[PDB]
PDB file of N, CA and C in Angstrom:
ATOM      1  N   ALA Y   1     176.571 181.528 142.331  1.00  0.00           N
ATOM      2  CA  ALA Y   1     177.737 180.689 142.681  1.00  0.00           C
ATOM      3  C   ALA Y   1     177.330 179.190 142.659  1.00  0.00           C
ATOM      4  N   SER Y   2     178.245 178.331 142.175  1.00  0.00           N
ATOM      5  CA  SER Y   2     178.003 176.869 142.054  1.00  0.00           C
ATOM      6  C   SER Y   2     176.837 176.609 141.063  1.00  0.00           C
ATOM      7  N   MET Y   3     177.172 176.481 139.766  1.00  0.00           N
ATOM      8  CA  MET Y   3     176.193 176.133 138.702  1.00  0.00           C
ATOM      9  C   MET Y   3     176.693 174.848 137.987  1.00  0.00           C
ATOM     10  N   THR Y   4     177.134 173.857 138.788  1.00  0.00           N
ATOM     11  CA  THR Y   4     177.527 172.517 138.284  1.00  0.00           C
ATOM     12  C   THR Y   4     176.272 171.605 138.173  1.00  0.00           C
ATOM     13  N   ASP Y   5     175.062 172.182 138.268  1.00  0.00           N
ATOM     14  CA  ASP Y   5     173.787 171.418 138.182  1.00  0.00           C
ATOM     15  C   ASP Y   5     172.647 172.370 137.728  1.00  0.00           C
ATOM     16  N   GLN Y   6     172.990 173.355 136.879  1.00  0.00           N
ATOM     17  CA  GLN Y   6     172.005 174.280 136.258  1.00  0.00           C
ATOM     18  C   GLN Y   6     170.787 173.447 135.770  1.00  0.00           C
ATOM     19  N   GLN Y   7     171.061 172.224 135.279  1.00  0.00           N
ATOM     20  CA  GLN Y   7     170.022 171.328 134.704  1.00  0.00           C
ATOM     21  C   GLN Y   7     168.844 171.237 135.710  1.00  0.00           C
ATOM     22  N   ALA Y   8     169.134 170.753 136.932  1.00  0.00           N
ATOM     23  CA  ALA Y   8     168.101 170.503 137.971  1.00  0.00           C
ATOM     24  C   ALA Y   8     167.393 171.833 138.347  1.00  0.00           C
ATOM     25  N   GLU Y   9     168.151 172.946 138.298  1.00  0.00           N
ATOM     26  CA  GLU Y   9     167.661 174.283 138.730  1.00  0.00           C
ATOM     27  C   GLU Y   9     166.358 174.609 137.950  1.00  0.00           C
ATOM     28  N   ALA Y  10     166.300 174.181 136.675  1.00  0.00           N
ATOM     29  CA  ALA Y  10     165.173 174.507 135.761  1.00  0.00           C
ATOM     30  C   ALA Y  10     163.845 173.931 136.327  1.00  0.00           C
ATOM     31  N   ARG Y  11     163.865 172.631 136.681  1.00  0.00           N
ATOM     32  CA  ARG Y  11     162.662 171.887 137.136  1.00  0.00           C
ATOM     33  C   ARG Y  11     162.196 172.488 138.491  1.00  0.00           C
ATOM     34  N   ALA Y  12     163.168 172.903 139.326  1.00  0.00           N
ATOM     35  CA  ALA Y  12     162.890 173.458 140.678  1.00  0.00           C
ATOM     36  C   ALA Y  12     162.107 174.794 140.559  1.00  0.00           C
ATOM     37  N   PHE Y  13     162.332 175.529 139.454  1.00  0.00           N
ATOM     38  CA  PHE Y  13     161.747 176.880 139.246  1.00  0.00           C
ATOM     39  C   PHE Y  13     160.255 176.726 138.839  1.00  0.00           C
ATOM     40  N   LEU Y  14     159.983 175.780 137.920  1.00  0.00           N
ATOM     41  CA  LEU Y  14     158.620 175.543 137.374  1.00  0.00           C
ATOM     42  C   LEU Y  14     157.903 174.518 138.294  1.00  0.00           C
ATOM     43  N   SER Y  15     156.582 174.356 138.091  1.00  0.00           N
ATOM     44  CA  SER Y  15     155.738 173.449 138.911  1.00  0.00           C
ATOM     45  C   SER Y  15     155.798 172.008 138.335  1.00  0.00           C
ATOM     46  N   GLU Y  16     154.882 171.139 138.800  1.00  0.00           N
ATOM     47  CA  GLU Y  16     154.807 169.721 138.360  1.00  0.00           C
ATOM     48  C   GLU Y  16     154.004 169.657 137.031  1.00  0.00           C
ATOM     49  N   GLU Y  17     152.776 170.219 137.063  1.00  0.00           N
ATOM     50  CA  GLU Y  17     151.838 170.172 135.908  1.00  0.00           C
ATOM     51  C   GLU Y  17     152.373 171.121 134.800  1.00  0.00           C
ATOM     52  N   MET Y  18     153.029 172.220 135.214  1.00  0.00           N
ATOM     53  CA  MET Y  18     153.560 173.248 134.281  1.00  0.00           C
ATOM     54  C   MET Y  18     154.526 172.549 133.287  1.00  0.00           C
ATOM     55  N   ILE Y  19     155.289 171.560 133.792  1.00  0.00           N
ATOM     56  CA  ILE Y  19     156.327 170.845 133.002  1.00  0.00           C
ATOM     57  C   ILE Y  19     155.570 170.048 131.904  1.00  0.00           C
ATOM     58  N   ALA Y  20     154.518 169.314 132.311  1.00  0.00           N
ATOM     59  CA  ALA Y  20     153.735 168.440 131.396  1.00  0.00           C
ATOM     60  C   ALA Y  20     153.232 169.263 130.179  1.00  0.00           C
ATOM     61  N   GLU Y  21     152.948 170.559 130.411  1.00  0.00           N
ATOM     62  CA  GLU Y  21     152.357 171.458 129.385  1.00  0.00           C
ATOM     63  C   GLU Y  21     153.408 171.698 128.269  1.00  0.00           C
ATOM     64  N   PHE Y  22     154.677 171.892 128.677  1.00  0.00           N
ATOM     65  CA  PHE Y  22     155.803 172.138 127.738  1.00  0.00           C
ATOM     66  C   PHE Y  22     156.000 170.875 126.855  1.00  0.00           C
ATOM     67  N   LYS Y  23     155.754 169.691 127.449  1.00  0.00           N
ATOM     68  CA  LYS Y  23     155.936 168.383 126.764  1.00  0.00           C
ATOM     69  C   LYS Y  23     155.059 168.380 125.482  1.00  0.00           C
ATOM     70  N   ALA Y  24     153.855 168.973 125.579  1.00  0.00           N
ATOM     71  CA  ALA Y  24     152.853 168.960 124.480  1.00  0.00           C
ATOM     72  C   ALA Y  24     153.503 169.463 123.162  1.00  0.00           C
ATOM     73  N   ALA Y  25     154.159 170.636 123.233  1.00  0.00           N
ATOM     74  CA  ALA Y  25     154.752 171.308 122.046  1.00  0.00           C
ATOM     75  C   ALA Y  25     155.991 170.514 121.548  1.00  0.00           C
ATOM     76  N   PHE Y  26     156.715 169.889 122.496  1.00  0.00           N
ATOM     77  CA  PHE Y  26     157.952 169.119 122.196  1.00  0.00           C
ATOM     78  C   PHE Y  26     157.594 167.954 121.233  1.00  0.00           C
ATOM     79  N   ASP Y  27     156.379 167.399 121.393  1.00  0.00           N
ATOM     80  CA  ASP Y  27     155.907 166.230 120.603  1.00  0.00           C
ATOM     81  C   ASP Y  27     155.628 166.679 119.141  1.00  0.00           C
ATOM     82  N   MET Y  28     155.245 167.956 118.958  1.00  0.00           N
ATOM     83  CA  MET Y  28     154.869 168.512 117.629  1.00  0.00           C
ATOM     84  C   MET Y  28     155.947 168.089 116.595  1.00  0.00           C
ATOM     85  N   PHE Y  29     157.219 168.051 117.035  1.00  0.00           N
ATOM     86  CA  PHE Y  29     158.377 167.763 116.147  1.00  0.00           C
ATOM     87  C   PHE Y  29     158.778 166.278 116.357  1.00  0.00           C
ATOM     88  N   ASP Y  30     158.612 165.784 117.598  1.00  0.00           N
ATOM     89  CA  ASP Y  30     158.885 164.366 117.954  1.00  0.00           C
ATOM     90  C   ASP Y  30     157.529 163.631 118.144  1.00  0.00           C
ATOM     91  N   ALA Y  31     157.009 163.044 117.050  1.00  0.00           N
ATOM     92  CA  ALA Y  31     155.766 162.226 117.081  1.00  0.00           C
ATOM     93  C   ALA Y  31     155.876 161.133 118.179  1.00  0.00           C
ATOM     94  N   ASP Y  32     156.522 160.005 117.827  1.00  0.00           N
ATOM     95  CA  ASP Y  32     156.734 158.861 118.753  1.00  0.00           C
ATOM     96  C   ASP Y  32     158.165 158.958 119.347  1.00  0.00           C
ATOM     97  N   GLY Y  33     158.272 159.515 120.570  1.00  0.00           N
ATOM     98  CA  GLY Y  33     159.565 159.631 121.291  1.00  0.00           C
ATOM     99  C   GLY Y  33     159.421 160.555 122.526  1.00  0.00           C
ATOM    100  N   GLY Y  34     159.285 161.872 122.278  1.00  0.00           N
ATOM    101  CA  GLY Y  34     159.181 162.886 123.359  1.00  0.00           C
ATOM    102  C   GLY Y  34     160.370 162.746 124.342  1.00  0.00           C
ATOM    103  N   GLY Y  35     161.595 162.975 123.827  1.00  0.00           N
ATOM    104  CA  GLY Y  35     162.840 162.835 124.622  1.00  0.00           C
ATOM    105  C   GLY Y  35     163.976 163.720 124.045  1.00  0.00           C
ATOM    106  N   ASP Y  36     164.086 163.746 122.704  1.00  0.00           N
ATOM    107  CA  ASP Y  36     165.186 164.452 121.994  1.00  0.00           C
ATOM    108  C   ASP Y  36     164.701 164.836 120.569  1.00  0.00           C
ATOM    109  N   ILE Y  37     165.118 166.027 120.094  1.00  0.00           N
ATOM    110  CA  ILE Y  37     164.749 166.556 118.754  1.00  0.00           C
ATOM    111  C   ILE Y  37     166.043 167.180 118.160  1.00  0.00           C
ATOM    112  N   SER Y  38     165.918 167.814 116.979  1.00  0.00           N
ATOM    113  CA  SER Y  38     167.061 168.475 116.291  1.00  0.00           C
ATOM    114  C   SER Y  38     167.390 169.821 116.993  1.00  0.00           C
ATOM    115  N   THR Y  39     168.669 170.234 116.911  1.00  0.00           N
ATOM    116  CA  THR Y  39     169.166 171.495 117.522  1.00  0.00           C
ATOM    117  C   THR Y  39     168.853 172.684 116.574  1.00  0.00           C
ATOM    118  N   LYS Y  40     168.818 172.416 115.255  1.00  0.00           N
ATOM    119  CA  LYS Y  40     168.559 173.456 114.223  1.00  0.00           C
ATOM    120  C   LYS Y  40     167.112 173.988 114.410  1.00  0.00           C
ATOM    121  N   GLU Y  41     166.195 173.095 114.829  1.00  0.00           N
ATOM    122  CA  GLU Y  41     164.746 173.409 114.948  1.00  0.00           C
ATOM    123  C   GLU Y  41     164.453 173.947 116.376  1.00  0.00           C
ATOM    124  N   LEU Y  42     165.262 173.518 117.360  1.00  0.00           N
ATOM    125  CA  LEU Y  42     165.117 173.893 118.796  1.00  0.00           C
ATOM    126  C   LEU Y  42     164.713 175.387 118.907  1.00  0.00           C
ATOM    127  N   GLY Y  43     165.557 176.281 118.355  1.00  0.00           N
ATOM    128  CA  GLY Y  43     165.318 177.744 118.392  1.00  0.00           C
ATOM    129  C   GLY Y  43     163.899 178.118 117.893  1.00  0.00           C
ATOM    130  N   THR Y  44     163.498 177.549 116.743  1.00  0.00           N
ATOM    131  CA  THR Y  44     162.141 177.778 116.166  1.00  0.00           C
ATOM    132  C   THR Y  44     161.086 177.577 117.288  1.00  0.00           C
ATOM    133  N   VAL Y  45     161.298 176.542 118.123  1.00  0.00           N
ATOM    134  CA  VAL Y  45     160.422 176.236 119.285  1.00  0.00           C
ATOM    135  C   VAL Y  45     160.415 177.489 120.204  1.00  0.00           C
ATOM    136  N   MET Y  46     161.615 178.014 120.512  1.00  0.00           N
ATOM    137  CA  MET Y  46     161.784 179.147 121.461  1.00  0.00           C
ATOM    138  C   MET Y  46     160.810 180.287 121.056  1.00  0.00           C
ATOM    139  N   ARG Y  47     160.693 180.543 119.739  1.00  0.00           N
ATOM    140  CA  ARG Y  47     159.905 181.683 119.195  1.00  0.00           C
ATOM    141  C   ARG Y  47     158.393 181.331 119.235  1.00  0.00           C
ATOM    142  N   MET Y  48     158.064 180.040 119.014  1.00  0.00           N
ATOM    143  CA  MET Y  48     156.658 179.572 118.904  1.00  0.00           C
ATOM    144  C   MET Y  48     156.050 179.378 120.321  1.00  0.00           C
ATOM    145  N   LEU Y  49     156.748 179.810 121.385  1.00  0.00           N
ATOM    146  CA  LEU Y  49     156.221 179.790 122.776  1.00  0.00           C
ATOM    147  C   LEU Y  49     155.698 181.211 123.112  1.00  0.00           C
ATOM    148  N   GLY Y  50     156.370 182.240 122.556  1.00  0.00           N
ATOM    149  CA  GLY Y  50     155.932 183.653 122.690  1.00  0.00           C
ATOM    150  C   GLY Y  50     157.145 184.575 122.981  1.00  0.00           C
ATOM    151  N   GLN Y  51     158.180 184.483 122.126  1.00  0.00           N
ATOM    152  CA  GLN Y  51     159.464 185.210 122.311  1.00  0.00           C
ATOM    153  C   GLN Y  51     159.614 186.236 121.155  1.00  0.00           C
ATOM    154  N   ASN Y  52     160.813 186.834 121.032  1.00  0.00           N
ATOM    155  CA  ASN Y  52     161.109 187.893 120.030  1.00  0.00           C
ATOM    156  C   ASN Y  52     162.657 187.982 119.778  1.00  0.00           C
ATOM    157  N   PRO Y  53     163.401 186.872 119.497  1.00  0.00           N
ATOM    158  CA  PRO Y  53     164.888 186.888 119.396  1.00  0.00           C
ATOM    159  C   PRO Y  53     165.392 186.947 117.930  1.00  0.00           C
ATOM    160  N   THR Y  54     166.723 187.047 117.760  1.00  0.00           N
ATOM    161  CA  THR Y  54     167.368 187.162 116.424  1.00  0.00           C
ATOM    162  C   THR Y  54     167.836 185.756 115.960  1.00  0.00           C
ATOM    163  N   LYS Y  55     167.846 185.538 114.631  1.00  0.00           N
ATOM    164  CA  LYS Y  55     168.208 184.230 114.023  1.00  0.00           C
ATOM    165  C   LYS Y  55     169.744 184.042 114.154  1.00  0.00           C
ATOM    166  N   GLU Y  56     170.498 185.137 113.948  1.00  0.00           N
ATOM    167  CA  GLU Y  56     171.983 185.127 114.016  1.00  0.00           C
ATOM    168  C   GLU Y  56     172.414 184.826 115.478  1.00  0.00           C
ATOM    169  N   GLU Y  57     171.645 185.360 116.447  1.00  0.00           N
ATOM    170  CA  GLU Y  57     171.937 185.194 117.896  1.00  0.00           C
ATOM    171  C   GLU Y  57     171.753 183.698 118.273  1.00  0.00           C
ATOM    172  N   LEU Y  58     170.828 183.012 117.578  1.00  0.00           N
ATOM    173  CA  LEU Y  58     170.536 181.573 117.819  1.00  0.00           C
ATOM    174  C   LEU Y  58     171.831 180.766 117.531  1.00  0.00           C
ATOM    175  N   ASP Y  59     172.627 181.245 116.556  1.00  0.00           N
ATOM    176  CA  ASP Y  59     173.952 180.659 116.223  1.00  0.00           C
ATOM    177  C   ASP Y  59     174.795 180.562 117.524  1.00  0.00           C
ATOM    178  N   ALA Y  60     174.795 181.646 118.321  1.00  0.00           N
ATOM    179  CA  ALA Y  60     175.597 181.733 119.571  1.00  0.00           C
ATOM    180  C   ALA Y  60     175.087 180.692 120.606  1.00  0.00           C
ATOM    181  N   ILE Y  61     173.757 180.646 120.793  1.00  0.00           N
ATOM    182  CA  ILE Y  61     173.086 179.791 121.813  1.00  0.00           C
ATOM    183  C   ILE Y  61     173.679 178.366 121.642  1.00  0.00           C
ATOM    184  N   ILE Y  62     173.938 177.972 120.379  1.00  0.00           N
ATOM    185  CA  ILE Y  62     174.396 176.601 120.023  1.00  0.00           C
ATOM    186  C   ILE Y  62     175.737 176.376 120.774  1.00  0.00           C
ATOM    187  N   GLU Y  63     176.696 177.302 120.579  1.00  0.00           N
ATOM    188  CA  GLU Y  63     178.072 177.175 121.132  1.00  0.00           C
ATOM    189  C   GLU Y  63     177.986 177.045 122.676  1.00  0.00           C
ATOM    190  N   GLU Y  64     177.002 177.736 123.281  1.00  0.00           N
ATOM    191  CA  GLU Y  64     176.849 177.813 124.758  1.00  0.00           C
ATOM    192  C   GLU Y  64     176.439 176.414 125.294  1.00  0.00           C
ATOM    193  N   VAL Y  65     175.547 175.728 124.557  1.00  0.00           N
ATOM    194  CA  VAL Y  65     174.965 174.426 124.982  1.00  0.00           C
ATOM    195  C   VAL Y  65     176.062 173.343 124.790  1.00  0.00           C
ATOM    196  N   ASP Y  66     176.170 172.800 123.563  1.00  0.00           N
ATOM    197  CA  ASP Y  66     177.180 171.764 123.221  1.00  0.00           C
ATOM    198  C   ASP Y  66     178.403 172.460 122.561  1.00  0.00           C
ATOM    199  N   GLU Y  67     179.151 173.234 123.375  1.00  0.00           N
ATOM    200  CA  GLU Y  67     180.390 173.920 122.922  1.00  0.00           C
ATOM    201  C   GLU Y  67     181.261 172.900 122.140  1.00  0.00           C
ATOM    202  N   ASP Y  68     181.263 171.637 122.606  1.00  0.00           N
ATOM    203  CA  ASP Y  68     182.101 170.556 122.023  1.00  0.00           C
ATOM    204  C   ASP Y  68     181.320 169.896 120.856  1.00  0.00           C
ATOM    205  N   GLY Y  69     181.350 170.542 119.671  1.00  0.00           N
ATOM    206  CA  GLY Y  69     180.736 169.985 118.440  1.00  0.00           C
ATOM    207  C   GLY Y  69     179.251 170.418 118.329  1.00  0.00           C
ATOM    208  N   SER Y  70     178.425 169.552 117.710  1.00  0.00           N
ATOM    209  CA  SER Y  70     176.966 169.788 117.547  1.00  0.00           C
ATOM    210  C   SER Y  70     176.216 168.429 117.508  1.00  0.00           C
ATOM    211  N   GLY Y  71     175.783 167.950 118.692  1.00  0.00           N
ATOM    212  CA  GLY Y  71     175.086 166.646 118.822  1.00  0.00           C
ATOM    213  C   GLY Y  71     173.552 166.827 118.694  1.00  0.00           C
ATOM    214  N   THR Y  72     172.845 166.744 119.838  1.00  0.00           N
ATOM    215  CA  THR Y  72     171.360 166.793 119.890  1.00  0.00           C
ATOM    216  C   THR Y  72     170.943 167.638 121.126  1.00  0.00           C
ATOM    217  N   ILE Y  73     169.634 167.642 121.438  1.00  0.00           N
ATOM    218  CA  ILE Y  73     169.077 168.393 122.597  1.00  0.00           C
ATOM    219  C   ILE Y  73     167.944 167.547 123.238  1.00  0.00           C
ATOM    220  N   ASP Y  74     167.787 167.646 124.573  1.00  0.00           N
ATOM    221  CA  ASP Y  74     166.771 166.883 125.345  1.00  0.00           C
ATOM    222  C   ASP Y  74     165.804 167.883 126.040  1.00  0.00           C
ATOM    223  N   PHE Y  75     164.773 167.338 126.714  1.00  0.00           N
ATOM    224  CA  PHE Y  75     163.741 168.149 127.417  1.00  0.00           C
ATOM    225  C   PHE Y  75     164.387 168.851 128.642  1.00  0.00           C
ATOM    226  N   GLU Y  76     165.421 168.218 129.229  1.00  0.00           N
ATOM    227  CA  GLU Y  76     166.091 168.718 130.459  1.00  0.00           C
ATOM    228  C   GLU Y  76     166.815 170.054 130.129  1.00  0.00           C
ATOM    229  N   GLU Y  77     167.852 169.967 129.271  1.00  0.00           N
ATOM    230  CA  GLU Y  77     168.595 171.158 128.776  1.00  0.00           C
ATOM    231  C   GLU Y  77     167.579 172.169 128.178  1.00  0.00           C
ATOM    232  N   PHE Y  78     166.472 171.651 127.610  1.00  0.00           N
ATOM    233  CA  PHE Y  78     165.456 172.482 126.908  1.00  0.00           C
ATOM    234  C   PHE Y  78     164.830 173.477 127.922  1.00  0.00           C
ATOM    235  N   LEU Y  79     164.569 172.994 129.151  1.00  0.00           N
ATOM    236  CA  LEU Y  79     164.000 173.823 130.247  1.00  0.00           C
ATOM    237  C   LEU Y  79     165.074 174.853 130.698  1.00  0.00           C
ATOM    238  N   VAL Y  80     166.361 174.470 130.598  1.00  0.00           N
ATOM    239  CA  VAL Y  80     167.498 175.309 131.063  1.00  0.00           C
ATOM    240  C   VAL Y  80     167.466 176.632 130.247  1.00  0.00           C
ATOM    241  N   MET Y  81     167.060 176.538 128.967  1.00  0.00           N
ATOM    242  CA  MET Y  81     167.000 177.703 128.043  1.00  0.00           C
ATOM    243  C   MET Y  81     165.891 178.669 128.546  1.00  0.00           C
ATOM    244  N   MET Y  82     164.632 178.191 128.523  1.00  0.00           N
ATOM    245  CA  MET Y  82     163.437 179.011 128.855  1.00  0.00           C
ATOM    246  C   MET Y  82     163.689 179.756 130.196  1.00  0.00           C
ATOM    247  N   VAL Y  83     164.490 179.143 131.086  1.00  0.00           N
ATOM    248  CA  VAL Y  83     164.820 179.715 132.420  1.00  0.00           C
ATOM    249  C   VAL Y  83     165.716 180.964 132.195  1.00  0.00           C
ATOM    250  N   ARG Y  84     166.812 180.792 131.434  1.00  0.00           N
ATOM    251  CA  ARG Y  84     167.788 181.874 131.133  1.00  0.00           C
ATOM    252  C   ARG Y  84     167.024 183.144 130.670  1.00  0.00           C
ATOM    253  N   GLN Y  85     166.016 182.962 129.797  1.00  0.00           N
ATOM    254  CA  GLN Y  85     165.277 184.086 129.163  1.00  0.00           C
ATOM    255  C   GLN Y  85     164.444 184.825 130.247  1.00  0.00           C
ATOM    256  N   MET Y  86     163.557 184.074 130.925  1.00  0.00           N
ATOM    257  CA  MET Y  86     162.586 184.625 131.908  1.00  0.00           C
ATOM    258  C   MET Y  86     163.342 185.563 132.890  1.00  0.00           C
ATOM    259  N   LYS Y  87     164.572 185.168 133.268  1.00  0.00           N
ATOM    260  CA  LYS Y  87     165.422 185.950 134.207  1.00  0.00           C
ATOM    261  C   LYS Y  87     165.826 187.278 133.512  1.00  0.00           C
ATOM    262  N   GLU Y  88     166.450 187.170 132.325  1.00  0.00           N
ATOM    263  CA  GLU Y  88     166.906 188.346 131.538  1.00  0.00           C
ATOM    264  C   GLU Y  88     168.151 188.957 132.236  1.00  0.00           C
ATOM    265  N   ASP Y  89     169.045 189.567 131.436  1.00  0.00           N
ATOM    266  CA  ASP Y  89     170.320 190.148 131.936  1.00  0.00           C
ATOM    267  C   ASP Y  89     170.063 191.616 132.368  1.00  0.00           C
ATOM    268  N   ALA Y  90     169.631 192.452 131.405  1.00  0.00           N
ATOM    269  CA  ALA Y  90     169.322 193.886 131.654  1.00  0.00           C
ATOM    270  C   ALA Y  90     170.599 194.588 132.155  1.00  0.00           C
TER     271      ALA Y  90
END
């Protein structure tokens, strides 16, 4: 109940140093910046952390994030994803 700040929920779940570790891989695609990358490549990141998802299903993830069009993605929303997975629906 009350998920008008899912964003903050992500950082609260992980530690301080744990966050810095995720930053390392984010730079692989963003040389000088480490703030925002492409949405088409975002999913590729999801798999290169240690996952097992479908390419067609990644199409859906897009609509869930920026339902209103297709802009960009940041490190904040980026943590919101990894959180959704670890929980799992079952």
